Design a protein around this nucleic acid. Sequence first.
DNA 1: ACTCTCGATG
RNA 2: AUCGAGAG
Lengths: 351, 65, 127, 88, 48, 142, 138, 114, 137, 56, 44, 100
Amino acid sequence: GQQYSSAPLRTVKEVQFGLFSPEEVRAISVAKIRFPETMDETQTRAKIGGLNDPRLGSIDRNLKCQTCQEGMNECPGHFGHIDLAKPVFHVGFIAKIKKVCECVCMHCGKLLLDEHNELMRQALAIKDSKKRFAAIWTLCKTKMVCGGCGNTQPTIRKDGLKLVGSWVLSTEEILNIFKHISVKDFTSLGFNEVFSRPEWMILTCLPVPPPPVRPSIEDDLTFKLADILKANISLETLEHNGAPHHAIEEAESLLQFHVATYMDNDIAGQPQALQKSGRPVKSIRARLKGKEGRIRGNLMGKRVDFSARTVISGDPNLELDQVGVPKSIAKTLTYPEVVTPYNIDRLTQLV
Amino acid sequence: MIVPVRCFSCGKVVGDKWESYLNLLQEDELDEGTALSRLGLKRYCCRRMILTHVDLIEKFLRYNP
Amino acid sequence: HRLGLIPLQSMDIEQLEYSRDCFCEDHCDKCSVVLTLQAFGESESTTNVYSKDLVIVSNLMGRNIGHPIIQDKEGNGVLICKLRKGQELKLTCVAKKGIAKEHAKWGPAAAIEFEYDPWNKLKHTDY
Amino acid sequence: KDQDDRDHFGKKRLDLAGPLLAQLFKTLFKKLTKDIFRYMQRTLAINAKTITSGLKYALATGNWGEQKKAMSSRAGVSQVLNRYTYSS
Amino acid sequence: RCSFEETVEILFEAGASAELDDCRGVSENVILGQMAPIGTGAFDVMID
Amino acid sequence: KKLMAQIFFGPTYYQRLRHMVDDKIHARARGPMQVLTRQPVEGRSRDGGLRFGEMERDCMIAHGAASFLKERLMEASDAFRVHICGICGLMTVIAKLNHNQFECKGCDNKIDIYQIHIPYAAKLLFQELMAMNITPRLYTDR
Amino acid sequence: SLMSCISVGTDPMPIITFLSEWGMEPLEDYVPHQSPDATRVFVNGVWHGVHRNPARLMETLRTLRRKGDINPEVSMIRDIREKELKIFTDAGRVYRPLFIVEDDESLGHKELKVRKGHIAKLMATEYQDEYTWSSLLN
Amino acid sequence: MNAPDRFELFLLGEGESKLKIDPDTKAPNAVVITFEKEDHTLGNLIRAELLNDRKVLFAAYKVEHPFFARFKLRIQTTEGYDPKDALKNACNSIINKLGALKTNFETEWNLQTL
Amino acid sequence: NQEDSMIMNQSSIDRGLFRSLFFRSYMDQEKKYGMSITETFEKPQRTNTLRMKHGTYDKLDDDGLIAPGVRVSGEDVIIGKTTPITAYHSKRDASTPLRSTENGIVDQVLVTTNQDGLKFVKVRVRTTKIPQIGDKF
Amino acid sequence: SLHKMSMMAHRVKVIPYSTFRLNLSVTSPYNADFDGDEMNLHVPQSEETRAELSQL
Amino acid sequence: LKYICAECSSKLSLSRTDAVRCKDCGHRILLKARTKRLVQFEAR
Amino acid sequence: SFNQFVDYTLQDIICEDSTLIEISFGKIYVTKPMVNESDGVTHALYPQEARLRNLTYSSGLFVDVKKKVFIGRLPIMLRSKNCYLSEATESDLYKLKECP
DNA sequence: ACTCTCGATG
RNA sequence: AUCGAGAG
Ligand SMILES: Nc1ncnc2c1ncn2[C@@H]1O[C@H](COP(=O)(O)CP(=O)(O)OP(=O)(O)O)[C@@H](O)[C@H]1O
Ligand SMILES: [Mg+2]
Ligand SMILES: [Mg+2]
Ligand SMILES: [Zn+2]
Ligand SMILES: [Zn+2]
Ligand SMILES: [Zn+2]
Ligand SMILES: [Zn+2]
Ligand SMILES: [Zn+2]
Ligand SMILES: [Zn+2]
């Protein structure tokens, strides 16, 4: 099998889903990602201190891997992290985020209706998170004017990968808004305390998947992370140096684009972000979507050992509960039988 | 390819009766049935074996290698 | 294959022996009969290779055996192959004693006609 | 008068090697004279590999319309000749 | 529910709402590769 | 002995199709694995395994054979041992074996650690979810 | 099918010229109210005007095709009850060969234009190997 | 590929005896004899000749599977009559009839032409 | 012969009923690189080449090919090619093994240059297939 | 595998030739003829799981 | 070793570092000659 | 179809759609299937040799340019006008190792 | 919106 | 990886 661990063997009883807070993201990471260069650095078969660090996981059939060793067969994946020059949107939350901004006015950070209203009392009475959020979102998006801070809440609509306002919303702005919704307002619309917050839906810094996720025989995910890092550094270069008005914004939307398409590539937006080979590239979303996905294709059903397949034929001289098995298959397929005093002779003869 | 040496069904030798058969078709100007009958092919399995056969080796010999 | 199907003389086959029974390595003269075949395209026309071209090499030591049966009128026998102009076929054949139960090439008989009670008086058949 | 029969074979066409190679060659040749226009405005050195490699690619892969995966003709326009039987 | 039709989006909205999986569903233990509470595994075997 | 009923007997043109057994026959007992999912490779020509499909799983559920279903989905395919933090419940654990140094940067855990047996594809799913800013926290208690 | 063929495609221009030079009024000179029963002529889905007395024109065109002056591949559709004339030279059309039945037989009725003499000439060409399919088509 | 050797139809394997005499546990004074490397050719004949003996109560042969060249022959005789002796008498009868048939055919063949 | 299965006369089969010839071609080619790096056709030894195959190379000649007539079976090596990427183990293995489930006899070997001047080889192996239990008719 | 009778536990009988031989009366639950049909066979790897196969 | 041409009856013996083409021919199609070590065939 | 493409369509594609500003194109010449070897020697290619050596059975296009030139290679359908097998007899096919 | 088997081309 | 043909 593998090896002996001092830890007790336990069984997974509960699965608590949640969001990844940037704090916990950078706290979990074991390597910062500064260089977009993959492995080779100036004609050298090694790993530069940027992408694919030996800290994330060595890849040369060695015996060492981030001090913990254990080769590359025992060691799983050690996550990294990369800090974005500016916060961007998580694609799979684009809708949800856009809903939250409609349940809470701008600048302030408070629910439009409280226990003073008649219908809001009935909407906040539901214990089910999804049903509650769905009941409040429909009875709060009609509110234009507003605790105080009476501001005319703008009409927000979706456009590409940004958000507009009618009386263009910045991602940093929405970050600042979701940062001020506090705790009591989270329970009122599904979210959790320390597990999932709206201030974590937007991507401040994103975790970097280890080599056992994106191998090399380079993987598409490595290329896409290289694109994200490239856009990031190209953004930072245009920010620290000469910073025009209508030039760095395109870079912000570029980083937003690459990050958004890094996870989901089949969006309403026509740019599907092709690759060098003309391939539409494989996103993480496509890795899971059946039927060739990971869930339906590698978890619900997967290829197994100790199996066989052959053309069938009828046999009048076989019993009902019998099966005619070819000799070659019989020699191929095998069964592990422990040596006991009852069968030691027979097993010895078989060996 | 070439005329099968023996009939599949029964086992009668029919490989030595090919050329003769051809003669009985072109030299004596007979029909296939009588030609097959004269060669001692009474059973229709051997009769088939010769009548049904196509000599493809002649087209094969048309190449120089 | 068709070489295997060539009818050979099996008169004194009873004083020949199985190769699996003989105490010799592979085969010998007491168990097997070796006969060669050397053909080559000579004329511009197609050069036929019959069973008469088979030449016994091994020592028959008296036993009537190995000789390929030729019931052919012209005396050619089974048409084995055909050669073009410069095509050559050189090989050797080791013939052994065998049962038709093992392979149909060792079949001594062809079709055996068999019929009992032509009037169905036993009523073994419902017409 | 009733609705037109959209399944009528008479109002349908079958494009063989001719029309397909015609579209393909038109594309590759227009691309060729385009590139030649570029070489001309840069200033006999005509990249003939365009037409050759293009035709060869579209005939080998079966993907009609050079190297652009946006093609709806990805259903294998050119296929390996089945030679299992003469009738096949 | 992720093991049928809408896969990724279900995981997304389940990650946003911070749901709790009881892991007593068949396909869930199938994913976890554990002996699911099915027929034979619908109980426990101890010693007395 | 004669046969009662007489038999329709005669020549008929039959053809031999391309599907022969020795080109179809296949059997594998622990063979080559893939690299991404660590599961048996696809194909007879690559000495691969056969997919225990969803419908097969459904059949084994209908039968009630849970242990068999677990065997097909672990020992027969990909069976992997992972370490889980007792706090956040993620695969952040740096398990330095042969030294018993089970570290966890982010929660400072060195004594409250766990070890579970899951398919490598499940570990892949969890990691891919983690890289997609989702935390599939795995607790081992009710 | 065994005899089906695909239309190579030819030039419709000489057909157009023929039509215009054979009693076909231009479409720009068409007055519907003073000639309602005028058969409109189509060529490759294009209206080139109408034409009175379409029977003579149709027999002329058909004769020209059967002779070979017009490409035998070109299709010609005379729609009586719809009063339309659709000529198609379009490439990609799937057509098939057919025997021609004409009632030009004096001492008889509606008979095939092909006779046993033609067949005898065909089998003469077959046994010799000058009278081929093209000769039948022409 | 998985096809067995042809000679396995008439050549006895390693340790395989020609005959296997087994005491039938069903009816008393009965026996089941396993013939190896033999088919219907011998079985049908022996069985048919075991029915001619009027001191034989039961006699039946069967080939349990066409893949394998072997057949079982069950014999039941009257008390005071060992079935092996019935088999021996049947066999000798067969041999005698065959010999007489050979002699007859030879004498009949010596009187023919062409 | 129930449920669309059939019984065939083994005797007639032995006489060549529904027998067939099966030819299979394996095509390999020597690679080329910008700095004149070329893969070579040869019969490499276990000490001079990396990885190698589990099958034997004893049927290969000096040119790293099989002489037509030699019987092959299992995972035998048909074409021997190496790619170079002092030092021990200076070559990588690129040999082509016979099909794991197939067998037969090397029918004919073809050695020819490519359009770009690359020495490439097509090896045709022959196997006679005899109608067995399970063959589709 | 439409219903549970598409996967059933059988007793092995090693035989020559390269075919999965099955009884005629087991055709119906599998819905299978012999005009080229192919079946799969899986093997248990412990006593408890083969107990599951044999007893269920 | 030795080789034989395709579209002509020759008998080249050009080993490695030679290859194409042929002796007094012009074509590059070269087949390999039959082995000297004979193989037996069970005439069945 | 292929003959129609070669003898008519090609010229239309070249002439009716291309002119630069000048260099006007003229007639199009389609040769017989040839091969430019690495040896440098260009020679006639026969289908058998094409299939054996993994070559492409294609001819060369040549256009007259005003104010001749090689513009590429067109794959040739077998038994077409620009194929050696069309005017070939049975014995010729046998000699060319092509099945009649 | 089920298992297989080959081929091709990047 | 994709595509094409085929097996129940
Ligand atoms: N997409 C698909 N999904 C599942 N099964 C399929 C399939 N396509 C074909 N099959 C299987 O292929 C089989 C086809 O066999 P058929 O010969 O068509 C039955 P039949 O001959 O009409 O019945 P009979 O044997 O009772 O006379 C079907 O029974 C089906 O199970
Ligand atoms: Mg059926
Ligand atoms: Mg079927
Ligand atoms: Zn590690
Ligand atoms: Zn406010
Ligand atoms: Zn016969
Ligand atoms: Zn001997
Ligand atoms: Zn932790
Ligand atoms: Zn030569």
